[PDB]
Amino acid sequence: MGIPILKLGECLLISIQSELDDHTAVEFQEDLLAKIHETSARGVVIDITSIDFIDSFIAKILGDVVSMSKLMGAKVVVTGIQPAVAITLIELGITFSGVLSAMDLESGLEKLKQELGE
Amino acid sequence: MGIPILKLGECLLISIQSELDDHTAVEFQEDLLAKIHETSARGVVIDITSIDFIDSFIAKILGDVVSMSKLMGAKVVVTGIQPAVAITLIELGITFSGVLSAMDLESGLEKLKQELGE
Amino acid sequence: MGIPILKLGECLLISIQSELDDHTAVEFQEDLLAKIHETSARGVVIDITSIDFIDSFIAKILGDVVSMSKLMGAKVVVTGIQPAVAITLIELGITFSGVLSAMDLESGLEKLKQELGE
Amino acid sequence: MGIPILKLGECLLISIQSELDDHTAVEFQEDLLAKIHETSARGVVIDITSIDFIDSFIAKILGDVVSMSKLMGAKVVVTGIQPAVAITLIELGITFSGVLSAMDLESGLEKLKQELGE
């Protein structure tokens, strides 16, 4: 089991369903950075559309995974954010800027289509 | 819980975890069909790279989910097959014929631009 | 002593006058498949215009070399089937698919020279 | 019954296997001219590659079917003559001129189509 990943044309896709806590995030984040080493990726598209809720401890992980993989050498687009998670749990209690969000995965990959030249 | 589907440029990208049982595979194969109605898809790229062993009666059903989509109105491609399962299960007298199996996910959508996008 | 087989430019033009039994049929079967490896070739033109009666023990020998030569590495064409022998071929019932026969040895070489090695 | 004729776009062909007597040739000499009446012709191509010894009366016959087929309109090509037939046995009372000999049946056509019919 775990959280999968999939190489796609010098980019990198990843789907995420409703995970539990920071333990389910650190078993994910150590499996995201380890395979962005192996693939010579340049953009990771974190599809998180299928998420009910996100705990406050995950806000200091997924609000800092964009500060994680940027230093690794690849841009990150947090695409597919639900309304319920976005209001008071990605609220004004974090340092959320420079994250390059999108709306849906077709417009997500369209944005990172124009970072690999075309 | 489950095995998800993400829309990406009028194509589908089923990525499966290590599922080795038919009563979950029949529980899975509804999700391929119940999504392809709602999103007007044309080619579904089933990624089976993360599956090591398969049971025989699964291949009498997963060998027929090609005919699920091919009658539904969208082509299907089976990418990333392990060398073990093609020599311990497929050499049995099942009747794979005209399935158009790719090699890896990079060469999948490159072949699946040649069904949509000139 | 034997059935006269000649060669043309990158083609073989075998002509049949008459036979005796299956012993001449297996001797002719050993003749053509050896000769097509004794030299190089890409197209066989079998001429059977001079035969008006073929036994079921013989039509399989002309069912052999019409399909053993395709696996050997050359395409085959059996031109000029008489209407008397053409009845008992499919009254037996054996489809000559992939054979693409013609009416006479001039028009038989029209398609084969066109198709492979234009 | 061993001597085929396989005419090819107003250009005939002749295969000749191992003969043993001139009683074969007299039944054969009428058969070539009976074909050149039934179809139009421009050049017959006699092939005698499979003969290592020749009766002196047979050399009178094969030296005659040149001039039997010149008067009908067509040219002749005596292609693929072996050494041992030619060296000490065609030194007999021949008058071989205007015969247009060749080396092999593939090049024997293009020494005739270069002259007549094209």
């Binding site: - | - | 059996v78 089937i81 053409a86 499919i90 489809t95 026969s101 009416m103 006479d104 | -």
Partner: protein, 115 residues
């Protein structure tokens, strides 16, 4: 009497079968392969648009459509009825009408009629 048709514009061969649903008319299998090498005829039409109805043996009619495949070019069963294709579980390329039956058989020998 017991003979149908044999004449051609020499690239195709037309043919017509009026109503004769009986197995003793084996001559439409017999005297058809005879004419296919008496001329050099290429893909030929059947045009059974008035034929009601073969019940027992279309094996004399649908296996003769494979006889012509090996002796010559293909064959077009032009214009079947509605009753004739009632239940036929027992492929070959057909058409609908004799005018457009001639088109997609002439497009095999690479010619048409345009001015």
């Amino acid at each position: 009497s017991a003979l149908q048709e044999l004449s051609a514009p020499l690239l195709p061969i037309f043919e017509k079968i009026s109503v004769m649903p009986l197995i003793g008319t084996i001559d439409t299998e017999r005297a058809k392969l005879i004419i296919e090498n008496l001329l050099i005829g290429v893909v030929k039409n059947r045009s059974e648009v008035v034929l009601i109805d073969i019940t027992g043996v279309p094996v004399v009619d649908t296996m003769v459509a494979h006889h012509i495949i090996q002796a010559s070019e293909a064959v077009r069963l032009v214009g079947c009825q509605a009753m004739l294709v009632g239940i036929r579980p027992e492929q070959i390329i057909t058409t609908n009408t004799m005018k457009k039956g001639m088109e997609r058989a002439l497009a095999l020998t690479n010619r048409e009629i345009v001015e």
